[PDB]
CSV table of C-alpha atoms in Angstrom, one decimal:
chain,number,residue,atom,x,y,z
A,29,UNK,CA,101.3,111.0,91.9
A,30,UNK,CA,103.1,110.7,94.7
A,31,UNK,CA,106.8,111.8,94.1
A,32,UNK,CA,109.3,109.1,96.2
A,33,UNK,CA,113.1,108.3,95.9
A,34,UNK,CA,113.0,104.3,96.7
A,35,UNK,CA,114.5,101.5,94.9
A,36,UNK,CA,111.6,99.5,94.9
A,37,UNK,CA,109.4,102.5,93.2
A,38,UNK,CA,112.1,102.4,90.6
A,39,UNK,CA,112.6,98.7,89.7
A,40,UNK,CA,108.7,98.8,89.6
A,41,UNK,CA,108.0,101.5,87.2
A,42,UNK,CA,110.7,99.4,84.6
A,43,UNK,CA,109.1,95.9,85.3
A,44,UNK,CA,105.5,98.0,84.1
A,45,UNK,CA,107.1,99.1,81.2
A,46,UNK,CA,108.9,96.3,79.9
A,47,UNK,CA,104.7,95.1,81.1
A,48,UNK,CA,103.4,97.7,78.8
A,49,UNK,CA,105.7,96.7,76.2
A,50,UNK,CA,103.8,93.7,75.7
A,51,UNK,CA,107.4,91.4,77.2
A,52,UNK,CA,106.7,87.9,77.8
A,53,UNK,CA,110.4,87.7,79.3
A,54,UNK,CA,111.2,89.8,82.1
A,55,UNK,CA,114.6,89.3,83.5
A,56,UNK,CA,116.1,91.7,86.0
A,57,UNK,CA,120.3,91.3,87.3
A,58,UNK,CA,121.0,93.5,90.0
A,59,UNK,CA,124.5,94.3,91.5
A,60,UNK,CA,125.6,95.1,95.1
A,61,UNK,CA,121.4,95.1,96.0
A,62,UNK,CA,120.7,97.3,93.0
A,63,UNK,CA,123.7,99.7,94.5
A,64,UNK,CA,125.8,99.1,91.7
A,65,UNK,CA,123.5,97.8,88.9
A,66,UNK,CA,120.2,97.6,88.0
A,67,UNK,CA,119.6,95.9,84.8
A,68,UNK,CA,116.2,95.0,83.2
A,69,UNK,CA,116.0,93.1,79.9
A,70,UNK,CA,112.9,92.4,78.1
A,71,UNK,CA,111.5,90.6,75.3
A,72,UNK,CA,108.6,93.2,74.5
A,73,UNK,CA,107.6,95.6,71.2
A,74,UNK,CA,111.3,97.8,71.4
A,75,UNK,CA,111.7,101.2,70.5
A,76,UNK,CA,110.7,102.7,67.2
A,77,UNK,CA,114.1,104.4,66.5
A,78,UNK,CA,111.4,108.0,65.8
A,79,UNK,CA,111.5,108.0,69.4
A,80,UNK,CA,114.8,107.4,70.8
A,81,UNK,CA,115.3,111.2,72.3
A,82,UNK,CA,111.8,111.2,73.1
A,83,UNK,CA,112.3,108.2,75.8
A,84,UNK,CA,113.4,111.2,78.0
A,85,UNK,CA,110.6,113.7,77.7
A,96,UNK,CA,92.5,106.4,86.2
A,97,UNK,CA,96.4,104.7,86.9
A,98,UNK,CA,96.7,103.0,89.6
A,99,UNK,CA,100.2,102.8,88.7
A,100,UNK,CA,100.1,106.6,89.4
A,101,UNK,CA,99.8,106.8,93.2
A,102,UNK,CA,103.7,106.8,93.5
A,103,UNK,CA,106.0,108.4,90.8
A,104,UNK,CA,109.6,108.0,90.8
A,105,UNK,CA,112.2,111.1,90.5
A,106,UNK,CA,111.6,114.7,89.7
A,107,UNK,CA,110.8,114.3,85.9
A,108,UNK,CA,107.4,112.6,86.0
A,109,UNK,CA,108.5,109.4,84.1
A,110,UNK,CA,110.7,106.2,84.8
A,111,UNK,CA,113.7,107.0,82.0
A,112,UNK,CA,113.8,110.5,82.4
A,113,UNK,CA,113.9,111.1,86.4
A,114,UNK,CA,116.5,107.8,86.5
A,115,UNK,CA,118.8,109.8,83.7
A,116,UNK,CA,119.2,113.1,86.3
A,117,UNK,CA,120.0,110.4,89.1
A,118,UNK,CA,122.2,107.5,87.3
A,119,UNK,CA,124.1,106.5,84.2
A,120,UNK,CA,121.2,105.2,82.0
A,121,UNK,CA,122.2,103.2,78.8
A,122,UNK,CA,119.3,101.1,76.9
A,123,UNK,CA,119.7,98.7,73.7
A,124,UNK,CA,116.5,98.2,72.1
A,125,UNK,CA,115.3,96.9,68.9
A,126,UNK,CA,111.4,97.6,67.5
A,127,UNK,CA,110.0,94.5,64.9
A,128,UNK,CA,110.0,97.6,62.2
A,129,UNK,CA,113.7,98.3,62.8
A,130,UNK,CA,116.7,96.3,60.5
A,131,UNK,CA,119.2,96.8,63.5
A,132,UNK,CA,119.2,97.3,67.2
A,133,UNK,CA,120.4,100.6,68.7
A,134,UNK,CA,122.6,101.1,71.7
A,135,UNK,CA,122.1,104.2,73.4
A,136,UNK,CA,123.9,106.2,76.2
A,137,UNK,CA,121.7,108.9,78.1
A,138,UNK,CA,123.8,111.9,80.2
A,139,UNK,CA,122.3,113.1,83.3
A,140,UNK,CA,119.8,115.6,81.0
A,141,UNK,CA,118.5,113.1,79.5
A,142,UNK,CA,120.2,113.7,76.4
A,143,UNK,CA,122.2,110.9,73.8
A,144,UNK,CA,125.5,110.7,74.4
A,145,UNK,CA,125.9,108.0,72.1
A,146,UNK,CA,123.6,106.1,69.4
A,147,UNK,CA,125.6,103.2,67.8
A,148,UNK,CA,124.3,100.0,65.6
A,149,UNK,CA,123.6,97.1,67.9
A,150,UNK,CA,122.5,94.0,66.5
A,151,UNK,CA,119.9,92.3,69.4
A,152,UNK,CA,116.7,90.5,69.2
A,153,UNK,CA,113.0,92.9,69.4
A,154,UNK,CA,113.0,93.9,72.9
A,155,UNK,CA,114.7,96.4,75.3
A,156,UNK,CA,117.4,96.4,78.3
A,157,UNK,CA,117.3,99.2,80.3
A,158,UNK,CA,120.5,99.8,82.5
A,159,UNK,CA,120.7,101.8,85.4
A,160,UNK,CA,123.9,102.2,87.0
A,161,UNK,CA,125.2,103.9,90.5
A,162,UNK,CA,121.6,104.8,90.9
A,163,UNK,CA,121.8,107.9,92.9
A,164,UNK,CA,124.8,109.0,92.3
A,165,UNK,CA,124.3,112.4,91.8
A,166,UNK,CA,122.5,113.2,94.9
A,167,UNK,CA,125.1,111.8,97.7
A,168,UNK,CA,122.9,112.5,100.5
A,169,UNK,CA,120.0,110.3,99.2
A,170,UNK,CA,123.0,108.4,97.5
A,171,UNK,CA,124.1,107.5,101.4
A,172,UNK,CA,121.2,106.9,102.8
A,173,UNK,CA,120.0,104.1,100.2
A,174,UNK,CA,123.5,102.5,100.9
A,175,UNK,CA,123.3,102.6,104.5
A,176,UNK,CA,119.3,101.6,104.5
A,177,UNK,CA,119.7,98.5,101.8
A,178,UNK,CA,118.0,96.2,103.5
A,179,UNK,CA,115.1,97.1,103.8
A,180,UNK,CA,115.4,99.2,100.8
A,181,UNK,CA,116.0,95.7,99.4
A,182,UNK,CA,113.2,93.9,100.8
A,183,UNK,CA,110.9,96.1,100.1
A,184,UNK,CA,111.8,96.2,96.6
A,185,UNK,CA,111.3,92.4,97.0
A,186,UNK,CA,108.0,92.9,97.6
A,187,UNK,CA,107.3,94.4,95.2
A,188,UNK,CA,109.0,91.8,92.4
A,189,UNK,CA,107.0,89.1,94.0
A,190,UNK,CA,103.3,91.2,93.9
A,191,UNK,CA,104.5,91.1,89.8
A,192,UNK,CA,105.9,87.9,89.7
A,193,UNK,CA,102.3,86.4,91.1
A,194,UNK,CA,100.3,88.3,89.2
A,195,UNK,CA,101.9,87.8,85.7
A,196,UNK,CA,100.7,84.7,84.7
A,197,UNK,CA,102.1,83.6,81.2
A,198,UNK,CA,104.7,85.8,81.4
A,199,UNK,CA,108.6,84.7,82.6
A,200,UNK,CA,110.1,86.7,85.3
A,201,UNK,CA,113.8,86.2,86.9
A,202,UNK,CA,115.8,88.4,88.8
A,203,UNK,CA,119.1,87.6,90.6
A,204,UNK,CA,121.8,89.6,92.7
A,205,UNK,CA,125.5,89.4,92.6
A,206,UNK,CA,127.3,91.0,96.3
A,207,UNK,CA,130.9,91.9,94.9
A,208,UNK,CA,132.7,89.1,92.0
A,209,UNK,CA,130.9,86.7,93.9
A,210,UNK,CA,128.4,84.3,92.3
A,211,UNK,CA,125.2,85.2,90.9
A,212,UNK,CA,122.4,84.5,94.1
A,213,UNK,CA,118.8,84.0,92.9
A,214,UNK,CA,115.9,86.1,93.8
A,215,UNK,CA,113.2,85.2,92.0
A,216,UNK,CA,111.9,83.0,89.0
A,217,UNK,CA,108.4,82.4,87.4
A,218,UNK,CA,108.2,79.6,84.8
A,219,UNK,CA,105.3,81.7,82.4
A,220,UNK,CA,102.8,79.3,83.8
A,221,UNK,CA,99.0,80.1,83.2
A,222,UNK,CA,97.7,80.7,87.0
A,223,UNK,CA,98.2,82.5,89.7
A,224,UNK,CA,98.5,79.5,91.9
A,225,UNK,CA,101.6,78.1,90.0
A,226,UNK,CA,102.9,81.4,90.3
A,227,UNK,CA,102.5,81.3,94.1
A,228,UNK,CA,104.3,77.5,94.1
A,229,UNK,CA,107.5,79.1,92.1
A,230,UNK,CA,107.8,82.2,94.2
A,231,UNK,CA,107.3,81.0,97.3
A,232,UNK,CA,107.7,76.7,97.0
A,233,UNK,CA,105.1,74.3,96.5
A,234,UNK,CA,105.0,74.0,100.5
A,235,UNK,CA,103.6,77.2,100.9
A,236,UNK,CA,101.0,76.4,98.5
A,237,UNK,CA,100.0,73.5,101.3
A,238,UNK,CA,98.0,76.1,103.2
A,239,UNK,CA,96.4,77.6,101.1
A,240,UNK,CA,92.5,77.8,100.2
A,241,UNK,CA,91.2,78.9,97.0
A,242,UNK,CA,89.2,82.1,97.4
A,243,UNK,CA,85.1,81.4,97.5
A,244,UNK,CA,82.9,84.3,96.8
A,245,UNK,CA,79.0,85.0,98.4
A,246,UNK,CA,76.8,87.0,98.5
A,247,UNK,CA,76.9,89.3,101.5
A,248,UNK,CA,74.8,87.6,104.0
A,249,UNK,CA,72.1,89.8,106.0
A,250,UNK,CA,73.9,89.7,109.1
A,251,UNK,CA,76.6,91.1,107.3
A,252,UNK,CA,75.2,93.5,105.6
A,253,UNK,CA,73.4,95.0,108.9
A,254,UNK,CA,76.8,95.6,110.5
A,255,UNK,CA,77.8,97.4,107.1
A,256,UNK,CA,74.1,99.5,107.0
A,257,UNK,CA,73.9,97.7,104.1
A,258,UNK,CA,70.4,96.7,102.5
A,259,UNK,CA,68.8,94.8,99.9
A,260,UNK,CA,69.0,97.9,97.5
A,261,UNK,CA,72.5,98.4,98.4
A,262,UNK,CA,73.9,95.1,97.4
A,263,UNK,CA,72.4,95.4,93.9
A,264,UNK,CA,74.7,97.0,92.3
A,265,UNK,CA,77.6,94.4,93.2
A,266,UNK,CA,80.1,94.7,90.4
A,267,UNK,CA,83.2,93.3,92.4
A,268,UNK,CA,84.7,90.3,91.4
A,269,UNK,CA,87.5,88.6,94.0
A,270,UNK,CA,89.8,86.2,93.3
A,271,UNK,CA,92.9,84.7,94.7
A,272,UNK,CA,94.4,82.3,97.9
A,273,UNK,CA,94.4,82.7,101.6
A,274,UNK,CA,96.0,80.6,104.4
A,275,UNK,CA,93.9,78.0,106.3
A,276,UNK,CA,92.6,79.5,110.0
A,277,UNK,CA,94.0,76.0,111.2
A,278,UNK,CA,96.6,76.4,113.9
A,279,UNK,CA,100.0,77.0,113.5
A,280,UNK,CA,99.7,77.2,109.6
A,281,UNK,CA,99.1,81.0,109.4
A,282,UNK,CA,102.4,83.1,109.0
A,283,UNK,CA,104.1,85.1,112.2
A,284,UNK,CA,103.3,88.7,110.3
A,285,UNK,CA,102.1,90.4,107.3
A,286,UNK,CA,105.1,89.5,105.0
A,287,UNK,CA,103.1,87.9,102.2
A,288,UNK,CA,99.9,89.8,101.6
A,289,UNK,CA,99.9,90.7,98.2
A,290,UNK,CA,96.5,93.1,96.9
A,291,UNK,CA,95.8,93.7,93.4
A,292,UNK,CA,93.2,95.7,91.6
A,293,UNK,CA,92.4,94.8,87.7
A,294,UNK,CA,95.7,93.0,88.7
A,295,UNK,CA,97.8,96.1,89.7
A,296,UNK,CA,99.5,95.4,92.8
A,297,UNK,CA,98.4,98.1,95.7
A,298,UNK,CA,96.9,98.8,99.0
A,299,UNK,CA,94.1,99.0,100.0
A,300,UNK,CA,93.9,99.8,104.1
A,301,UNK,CA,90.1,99.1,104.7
A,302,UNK,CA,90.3,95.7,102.4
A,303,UNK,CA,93.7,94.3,104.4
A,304,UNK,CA,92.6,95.5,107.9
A,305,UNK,CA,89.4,93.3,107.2
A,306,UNK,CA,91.0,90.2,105.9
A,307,UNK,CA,93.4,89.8,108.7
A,308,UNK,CA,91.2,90.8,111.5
A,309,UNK,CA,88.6,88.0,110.0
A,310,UNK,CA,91.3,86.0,110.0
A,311,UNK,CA,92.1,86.3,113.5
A,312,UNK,CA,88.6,85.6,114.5
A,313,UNK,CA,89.6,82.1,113.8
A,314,UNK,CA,93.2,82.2,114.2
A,315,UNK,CA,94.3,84.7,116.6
A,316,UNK,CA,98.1,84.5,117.0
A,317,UNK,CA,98.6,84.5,113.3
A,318,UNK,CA,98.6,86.7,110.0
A,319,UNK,CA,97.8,85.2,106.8
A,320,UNK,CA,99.7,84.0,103.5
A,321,UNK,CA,96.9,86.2,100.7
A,322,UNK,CA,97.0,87.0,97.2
A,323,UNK,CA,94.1,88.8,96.5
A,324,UNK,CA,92.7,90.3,93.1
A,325,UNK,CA,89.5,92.6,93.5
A,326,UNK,CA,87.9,93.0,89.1
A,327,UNK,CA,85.9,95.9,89.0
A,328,UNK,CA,85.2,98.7,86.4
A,329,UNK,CA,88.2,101.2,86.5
A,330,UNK,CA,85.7,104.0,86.1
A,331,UNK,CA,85.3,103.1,90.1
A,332,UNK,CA,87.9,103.7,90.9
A,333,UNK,CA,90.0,107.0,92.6
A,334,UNK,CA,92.3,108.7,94.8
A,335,UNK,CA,93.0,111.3,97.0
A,342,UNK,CA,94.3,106.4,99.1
A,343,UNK,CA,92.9,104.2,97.1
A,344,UNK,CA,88.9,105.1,96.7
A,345,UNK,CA,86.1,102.5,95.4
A,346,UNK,CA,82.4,103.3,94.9
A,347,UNK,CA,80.6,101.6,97.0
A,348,UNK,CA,83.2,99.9,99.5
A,349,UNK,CA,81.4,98.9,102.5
A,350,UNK,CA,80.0,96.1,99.8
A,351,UNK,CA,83.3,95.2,98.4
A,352,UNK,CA,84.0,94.5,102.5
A,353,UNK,CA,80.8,93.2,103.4
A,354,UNK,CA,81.7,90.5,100.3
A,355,UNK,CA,84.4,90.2,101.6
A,356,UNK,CA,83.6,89.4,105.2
A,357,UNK,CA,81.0,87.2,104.9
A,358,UNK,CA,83.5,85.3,101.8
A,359,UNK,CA,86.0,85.1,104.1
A,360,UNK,CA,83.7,83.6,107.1
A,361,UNK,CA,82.1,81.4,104.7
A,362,UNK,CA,85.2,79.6,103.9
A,363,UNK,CA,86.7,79.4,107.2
A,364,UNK,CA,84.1,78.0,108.6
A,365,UNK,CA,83.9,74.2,110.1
């Protein structure tokens, strides 16, 4: 899709493969705010050793695309030192490998390590100084948006153990984040974020649109047949005081790929506001629908105005006294 240069499009693309690799650890040490290191380990299927040199040659996962060379490993070789251990269930013996900035093996030694892969990425940048300067002197938010990012995973991933930390200097390792491979969203909320924010927060309640609802949307009878959408997820009470001072955790997800969607996050927060005006809302929001629904040119869904109108009259439904 998309082609960007950020550190948060970067640590994402490896957190969906070690994802795709079927991982049920996911552990991530960073160094200097990724600056320095960037180091993502992973408990999933490895490598099959067939396709070592070949690691550098309707996805909503697609929007963005990281580097130059359409693919996580292979833009990150041209623009860091890339070295990856790895070990498939079919292989005797792990492998070691070091990657030039090509993509090309430097190096391939025997390294015994259990089935899984770590992917290291250091002096990301490097060999592009301008963008190299820019991402030093823009870390924070560079940083914090990358943040955002871990945390949309982190929620999502139920079952699956996910820990990141970051080291400034020889100073001590600082935590980040830390899932416990619990079994629902909402525990996955409480270890992100603390059991207090999990306080005030409702349970999502799907309806059916209501009529009033559905006039405002031109929405009829016929219209709200084919309702295929499926939301799930936790919102902050409308009570006073208990919503958040802006936008900083509102995490979307499609078929549980983080994303979003404009129309669907102007609409939640504006409902909100009807009830609590000087506040923004804590939300976690999963939207299950057929893929084949689904497009871009922006995320696109068939039939939208629904999804909202469900959403709307949802969203009224359970802030109402």
């Amino acid at each position: 899709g998309q082609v960007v240069l950020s550190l948060s499009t970067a640590v994402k693309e490896l957190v969906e493969n070690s994802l795709d690799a079927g991982a049920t650890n996911i552990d991530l040490k960073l160094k200097d705010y990724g600056v320095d290191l960037i180091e993502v380990s992973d408990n999933g299927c490895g490598v099959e050793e067939e396709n070592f040199e070949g690691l550098t040659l309707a996805d909503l996962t697609q929007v963005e695309t990281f580097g130059f060379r359409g693919e996580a490993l292979s833009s990150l070789c041209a623009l860091s030192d890339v070295t990856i251990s790895t070990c498939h269930a079919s292989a005797k013996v792990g492998t070691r490998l070091m990657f030039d900035h090509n993509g090309k093996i430097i190096q391939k030694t025997p390294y015994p390590r259990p089935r899984g892969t770590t992917v290291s990425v250091q002096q990301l940048f490097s060999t592009l100084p301008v963008r190299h300067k820019e991402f030093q002197r823009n870390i924070k938010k560079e940083y914090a948006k990358m943040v955002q990012v871990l945390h949309a995973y982190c929620i999502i991933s139920a079952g699956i153990r996910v820990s990141c930390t970051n080291q400034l200097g020889q100073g001590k390792r600082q935590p980040v984040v830390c899932t416990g491979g619990s079994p629902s969203i909402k525990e996955n909320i409480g270890s992100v974020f603390g059991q207090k924010q999990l306080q005030s927060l409702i349970p999502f309640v799907q309806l059916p649109p209501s009529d009033s609802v559905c006039e405002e949307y031109g929405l009829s009878c016929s219209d709200a047949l084919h309702n295929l959408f499926y939301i799930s997820g936790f919102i902050s009470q409308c009570t006073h005081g208990v919503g958040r001072s802006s936008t900083d955790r509102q995490f979307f997800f499609i078929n549980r790929r983080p994303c979003d969607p404009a129309k669907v996050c102007r609409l939640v927060n504006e409902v909100y506001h009807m009830y609590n005006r000087h506040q923004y809302p804590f939300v976690v929001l999963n939207i299950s629908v057929d893929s084949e629904c689904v497009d871009i040119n922006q995320i696109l869904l068939q039939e939208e105005k629904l999804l909202l109108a469900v959403l709307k009259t949802s969203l009224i439904g359970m802030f109402d006294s």
